[PDB]
Design a protein around this motif. Structure first.
Motif, PDB file in Angstrom:
ATOM      1  N   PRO C  68      44.112  16.153  64.294  1.00  0.00           N
ATOM      2  CA  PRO C  68      43.162  15.963  65.384  1.00  0.00           C
ATOM      3  C   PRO C  68      42.419  14.665  65.161  1.00  0.00           C
ATOM      4  O   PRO C  68      42.195  14.240  64.027  1.00  0.00           O
ATOM      5  CB  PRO C  68      42.228  17.163  65.244  1.00  0.00           C
ATOM      6  CG  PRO C  68      43.078  18.198  64.643  1.00  0.00           C
ATOM      7  CD  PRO C  68      43.937  17.462  63.651  1.00  0.00           C
ATOM      8  N   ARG C  69      42.033  14.027  66.249  1.00  0.00           N
ATOM      9  CA  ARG C  69      41.552  12.663  66.153  1.00  0.00           C
ATOM     10  C   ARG C  69      40.036  12.602  66.166  1.00  0.00           C
ATOM     11  O   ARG C  69      39.360  13.447  66.754  1.00  0.00           O
ATOM     12  CB  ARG C  69      42.098  11.807  67.289  1.00  0.00           C
ATOM     13  CG  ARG C  69      41.945  10.340  67.011  1.00  0.00           C
ATOM     14  CD  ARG C  69      42.668   9.496  68.028  1.00  0.00           C
ATOM     15  NE  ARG C  69      42.186   8.123  67.986  1.00  0.00           N
ATOM     16  CZ  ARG C  69      42.700   7.132  68.701  1.00  0.00           C
ATOM     17  NH1 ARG C  69      43.712   7.359  69.520  1.00  0.00           N
ATOM     18  NH2 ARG C  69      42.197   5.912  68.594  1.00  0.00           N
ATOM     19  N   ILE C  70      39.514  11.586  65.491  1.00  0.00           N
ATOM     20  CA  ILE C  70      38.125  11.175  65.612  1.00  0.00           C
ATOM     21  C   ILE C  70      38.116   9.693  65.932  1.00  0.00           C
ATOM     22  O   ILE C  70      38.770   8.901  65.245  1.00  0.00           O
ATOM     23  CB  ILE C  70      37.315  11.449  64.338  1.00  0.00           C
ATOM     24  CG1 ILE C  70      35.851  11.093  64.586  1.00  0.00           C
ATOM     25  CG2 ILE C  70      37.875  10.651  63.187  1.00  0.00           C
ATOM     26  CD1 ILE C  70      34.897  11.761  63.651  1.00  0.00           C
ATOM     27  N   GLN C  71      37.373   9.318  66.965  1.00  0.00           N
ATOM     28  CA  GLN C  71      37.409   7.945  67.433  1.00  0.00           C
ATOM     29  C   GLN C  71      36.687   7.007  66.483  1.00  0.00           C
ATOM     30  O   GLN C  71      35.670   7.347  65.877  1.00  0.00           O
ATOM     31  CB  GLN C  71      36.801   7.839  68.824  1.00  0.00           C
ATOM     32  CG  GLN C  71      37.715   8.375  69.882  1.00  0.00           C
ATOM     33  CD  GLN C  71      38.956   7.525  69.999  1.00  0.00           C
ATOM     34  OE1 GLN C  71      38.875   6.299  69.995  1.00  0.00           O
ATOM     35  NE2 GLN C  71      40.112   8.167  70.084  1.00  0.00           N
ATOM     36  N   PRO C  75      30.013   7.990  66.714  1.00  0.00           N
ATOM     37  CA  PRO C  75      28.811   7.782  65.902  1.00  0.00           C
ATOM     38  C   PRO C  75      28.978   8.200  64.461  1.00  0.00           C
ATOM     39  O   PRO C  75      28.578   7.458  63.560  1.00  0.00           O
ATOM     40  CB  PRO C  75      27.773   8.647  66.617  1.00  0.00           C
ATOM     41  CG  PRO C  75      28.192   8.623  68.036  1.00  0.00           C
ATOM     42  CD  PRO C  75      29.685   8.427  68.079  1.00  0.00           C
ATOM     43  N   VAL C  76      29.593   9.347  64.209  1.00  0.00           N
ATOM     44  CA  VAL C  76      29.745   9.783  62.831  1.00  0.00           C
ATOM     45  C   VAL C  76      30.734   8.893  62.096  1.00  0.00           C
ATOM     46  O   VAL C  76      30.520   8.533  60.933  1.00  0.00           O
ATOM     47  CB  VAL C  76      30.167  11.260  62.793  1.00  0.00           C
ATOM     48  CG1 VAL C  76      29.873  11.861  61.438  1.00  0.00           C
ATOM     49  CG2 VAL C  76      29.460  12.022  63.884  1.00  0.00           C
ATOM     50  N   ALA C  77      31.812   8.491  62.768  1.00  0.00           N
ATOM     51  CA  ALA C  77      32.712   7.514  62.168  1.00  0.00           C
ATOM     52  C   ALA C  77      31.994   6.221  61.826  1.00  0.00           C
ATOM     53  O   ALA C  77      32.297   5.595  60.804  1.00  0.00           O
ATOM     54  CB  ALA C  77      33.880   7.232  63.108  1.00  0.00           C
ATOM     55  N   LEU C  78      31.027   5.816  62.640  1.00  0.00           N
ATOM     56  CA  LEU C  78      30.272   4.622  62.297  1.00  0.00           C
ATOM     57  C   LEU C  78      29.315   4.877  61.148  1.00  0.00           C
ATOM     58  O   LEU C  78      29.061   3.980  60.340  1.00  0.00           O
ATOM     59  CB  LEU C  78      29.510   4.124  63.514  1.00  0.00           C
ATOM     60  CG  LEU C  78      30.396   3.465  64.557  1.00  0.00           C
ATOM     61  CD1 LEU C  78      29.584   3.141  65.786  1.00  0.00           C
ATOM     62  CD2 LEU C  78      30.992   2.210  63.969  1.00  0.00           C
TER      63      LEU C  78
END
Ligand SMILES: [Zn+2]
Lengths: 145, 49, 107, 86, 49, 83, 57, 43
Positions: C68-71, C75-78
Motif C-alpha cells: 500500500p502506498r504513502i505519498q 505530511p507524515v512522509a515529510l
RNA sequence: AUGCGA
C-alpha cells in the motif's frame, strides 16, 4: 477481487496487499459473538471442552512460542500499561506468529479483556469444581484459534 | 457515524477494510470509474462503465 | 532542513534537488507550528530498516511496488524524511483489535 | 415414393425418423436415440424493443431453418402459384 | 534482473500502472506545450478538425 | 514455487473451502469408478461415500495452497486437520 | 373476499432445456418461450460472496 | 498536433524526449525509485 | 420502452 491470502494477509485477486490482517484480528464475524462471552463459555465449559478438545490437535501446533512472546509482551505491557510511547520493541503477538499455528497469538485487546475477566472472576474460580484460569485460558485461546 | 445514526451495527472489520481499499494509493481514492482506472484488471474496467 | 519564513522561489526550488550527495528539505515555518505526529488521529509511524524491509518483503513474498502506498508529499512522509522506496511500520490502535501493525511503502 | 433426408438422418442406427421435443429444445430420433443437435435458436427473451426496420423478411428464396424435418415436397420450378392460378 | 526485483516479462503492479498513466499525461502536456518546433525550430500550422 | 514440506508454514486446519472442494472432487471421482477404499456399506450417494473416505483419510488427494507470490504448500488430506 | 387475477401460481416456469439466442447460445427469455430465469449481477456477486466459486462457474 | 511539419519530428527536445523514453522504459520494469532518480543526471 | 405483481 479482495480476498484473504493463505498468509492471512488480505490481497486482491491482483495480488496487491490491502491489509496485513483481517480487521487486524483475523476473526470471523460469524464466530465472534461468543468469543468474548467468557462467563457463558465457563458455565458450559465441559461442553466446549468436548467440542474443542485440544489433545487431538496439541500434536499439530506450538503452545509456547506465542505464549513466550506473550511473556515478553506482558513485560513491556505491564511496564507501559502515552500512546505515542509505543511498544516499538514489541509488535503485537499477531505480528510475530501465525495466529492459526501458535495458540496464544491473539489481539492484545482480546488478551487484555480475557485476563481482566480472569481477575474479576477469580472468585468463580473459587466457586468451581474442576476448572482453572490456566485450563480456561487454554480453552479461550483455542476457541480464538 | 452514519450507521450509528440509524442505530445499525456494522463490524469495524468491514468499514476498516473498505477504508484501507480507499487508501490503497495513499490518497482518497473513490470507488467510481476514476479510482477504477488505476487498478490493473482491464476487464474489470471494461465491465463497469 | 531549510526552514523558510514565508516562501522560497521556484528558481531556488530548482536548486533543491541540485546536490545529490545530500538532501535538502524545504519547510513552512508556519506549517511546522504543530506536530502532526502528536495528533490523536495519527498512529505511530516507525521507519523500517533496510533489513527489516528485506525481511518483511520476504515473509510476505511480494514486490515493494505491491505494498500500500504513502505519498512522498504526505505530511507524515515529510516529517519522517521518508525516502523513495522506504517502508514505514504503522502501529495503530484499533477499536476492535487493539494494537494493530500495518505497513506502507513510500513511493 | 420420395426419400427421407433433406436435412438429417440418424447416422447411428439406420433409423430415418426424427422427433421434436419442443419442451427439450431437442431434435431427436423418432424411433431410436440421441441428440440430433444440442443447439437451439430463436425464441427470444423479454427485450425486443423493435428498432429493427428488419428489411429482410422471408420470401422463400433463402430457404428456412427447415424446422420441419418432416418433408415430402417435390422438385419445384419456382412458385407454382402462377400455374396454380392458371 | 540480478536482484529478481523484476523479470524478462517486466514488473507490473497497481502503483506502476498509476505512475505510468501520470507520466504519460504530463508527457502529453509537454508534447502539446511546444507552440513551435524544437528539433527543427519550424512553425507548424495549427491543426483543426 | 515449491515450498518444501519441512518449511510449510500454513494453517494445520482444513478450511471449509478446502473441505468443500475435496469432498466435491473426490465424490466425483468415486462416481467415475475410482477404486473405493472403504466399505460401501449400502450407500448410493457418491457424495456421502466421499464423506466416509474423508472420515477415514482414504482420500488420496493433496491440497495445493497457493500463495500470491506463486509459492505453494502441497498438503495431504491425511495430514491437514480435517476439522 | 375477492380473488386477484394474478394467479402467479399459474405463472410458474421451469427450464431444464430449451432454445437459445443465436448471438449467444444462452436461454431465450419468457415463460412462453420456455426461457430460463436470469442470474443477475447481484446473484453472481452473492455466489462469489459464499465462496461457492464452483457453484458460480 | 504534436509533430513538426517541416522536419517531421516531435517539437520536444530530442534529448528531453529520450529522457521520457528512459522513464517509460524504467516503468515497464516498474523501477520507480530509479525513474525519479533519473531526473538528477545533469551536467 | 407503457402499465403492473413481488
Ligand atoms: Zn520539427
Amino acid at each position: 477481487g479482495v480476498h484473504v491470502s493463505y498468509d492471512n494477509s488480505i490481497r486482491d485477486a491482483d495480488g496487491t496487499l490491502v491489509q496485513f490482517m483481517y480487521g487486524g484480528d483475523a476473526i470471523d464475524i460469524t464466530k465472534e459473538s461468543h468469543m468474548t462471552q467468557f462467563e457463558f463459555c465457563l458455565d458450559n465449559y465441559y461442553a466446549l471442552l468436548k467440542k474443542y478438545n485440544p489433545s487431538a490437535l496439541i500434536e499439530h501446533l506450538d503452545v509456547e512460542s506465542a505464549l513466550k512472546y506473550s511473556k515478553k509482551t506482558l513485560k513491556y505491557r505491564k511496564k507501559h500499561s502515552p500512546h505515542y510511547k509505543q511498544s516499538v520493541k514489541y509488535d503485537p503477538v499477531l505480528a510475530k506468529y501465525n495466529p492459526a499455528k501458535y495458540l496464544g497469538s491473539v489481539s492484545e485487546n482480546f488478551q487484555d479483556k480475557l485476563e481482566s475477566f480472569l481477575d474479576k472472576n477469580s472468585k468463580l474460580f473459587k466457586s468451581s469444581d474442576g476448572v482453572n484460569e490456566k485450563k480456561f485460558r487454554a480453552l479461550m485461546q483455542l476457541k480464538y484459534m | 457515524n452514519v450507521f450509528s445514526r440509524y442505530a445499525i451495527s456494522v463490524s469495524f472489520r468491514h468499514l476498516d477494510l473498505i477504508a484501507d481499499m480507499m487508501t490503497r494509493q495513499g490518497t482518497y481514492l473513490a470507488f467510481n470509474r476514476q479510482g477504477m482506472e488505476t487498478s490493473t484488471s482491464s476487464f474489470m474496467k471494461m465491465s463497469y462503465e | 532542513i531549510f526552514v523558510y519564513q514565508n516562501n522560497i522561489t521556484p528558481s531556488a526550488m530548482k536548486l533543491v534537488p541540485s546536490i545529490p550527495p545530500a538532501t535538502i528539505e524545504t519547510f513552512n515555518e508556519a506549517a511546522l507550528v504543530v506536530n502532526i505526529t502528536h495528533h490523536e488521529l495519527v498512529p505511530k509511524h516507525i521507519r523500517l530498516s533496510s533489513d527489516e524491509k528485506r525481511e518483511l518483503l520476504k515473509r510476505y513474498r511480494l514486490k515493494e511496488s505491491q505494498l500500500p502506498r504513502i505519498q512522498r508529499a504526505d505530511p507524515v512522509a515529510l516529517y519522517l524524511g521518508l525516502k523513495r522506496g522506504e517502508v514505514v511500520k504503522i502501529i495503530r490502535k484499533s477499536e476492535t483489535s487493539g494494537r494493530y501493525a500495518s505497513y506502507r511503502i513510500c513511493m | 415414393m420420395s426419400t427421407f433426408i433433406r436435412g438429417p438422418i440418424c447416422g447411428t442406427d439406420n433409423c430415418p425418423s426424427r422427433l421434436w421435443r419442443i419442451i427439450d429444445g431437442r431434435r431427436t430420433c423418432q424411433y431410436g436415440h440421441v441428440m440430433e443437435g444440442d443447439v437451439e435458436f430463436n425464441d427470444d427473451e423479454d427485450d425486443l424493443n423493435g428498432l429493427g426496420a428488419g428489411v429482410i423478411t422471408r420470401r422463400l428464396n433463402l430457404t428456412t431453418n427447415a424446422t420441419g424435418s418432416f418433408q415430402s415436397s417435390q422438385l419445384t420450378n419456382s412458385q407454382l402459384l402462377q400455374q396454380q392460378q392458371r | 534482473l540480478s536482484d529478481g526485483r523484476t523479470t524478462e516479462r517486466g514488473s507490473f503492479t497497481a502503483t506502476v500502472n498509476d505512475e505510468r498513466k501520470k507520466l504519460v499525461h504530463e508527457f502529453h502536456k509537454k508534447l502539446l506545450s511546444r507552440g513551435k518546433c524544437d528539433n527543427c525550430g519550424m512553425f507548424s500550422p495549427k491543426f483543426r478538425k | 514455487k515449491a515450498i518444501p514440506k519441512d518449511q510449510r508454514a500454513t494453517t494445520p486446519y482444513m478450511t471449509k473451502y478446502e473441505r468443500a472442494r475435496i469432498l466435491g472432487t473426490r465424490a466425483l471421482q468415486i462416481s467415475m469408478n475410482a477404486p473405493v477404499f472403504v466399505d460401501l456399506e449400502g450407500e448410493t450417494d457418491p457424495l456421502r461415500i466421499a464423506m466416509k473416505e474423508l472420515a477415514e483419510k482414504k482420500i488420496p488427494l493433496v491440497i495445493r495452497r497457493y500463495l500470491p507470490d506463486g509459492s505453494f504448500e502441497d498438503w495431504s488430506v491425511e495430514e491437514l486437520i480435517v476439522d | 373476499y375477492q380473488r386477484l387475477r394474478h394467479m402467479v401460481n399459474d405463472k410458474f416456469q421451469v427450464r431444464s432445456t430449451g432454445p437459445v439466442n443465436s448471438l449467444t447460445m444462452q436461454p431465450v427469455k419468457g415463460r412462453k418461450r420456455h426461457g430460463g430465469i436470469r442470474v443477475g449481477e447481484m446473484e453472481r456477486d452473492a455466489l462469489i460472496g459464499h465462496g461457492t466459486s464452483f457453484l458460480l462457474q | 498536433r504534436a509533430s513538426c511539419l517541416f522536419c517531421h519530428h516531435f517539437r520536444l527536445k530530442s534529448v528531453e524526449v529520450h529522457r521520457y523514453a528512459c522513464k517509460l522504459r524504467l516503468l515497464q520494469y516498474g523501477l520507480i525509485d530509479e525513474s525519479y532518480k533519473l531526473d538528477e543526471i545533469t551536467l
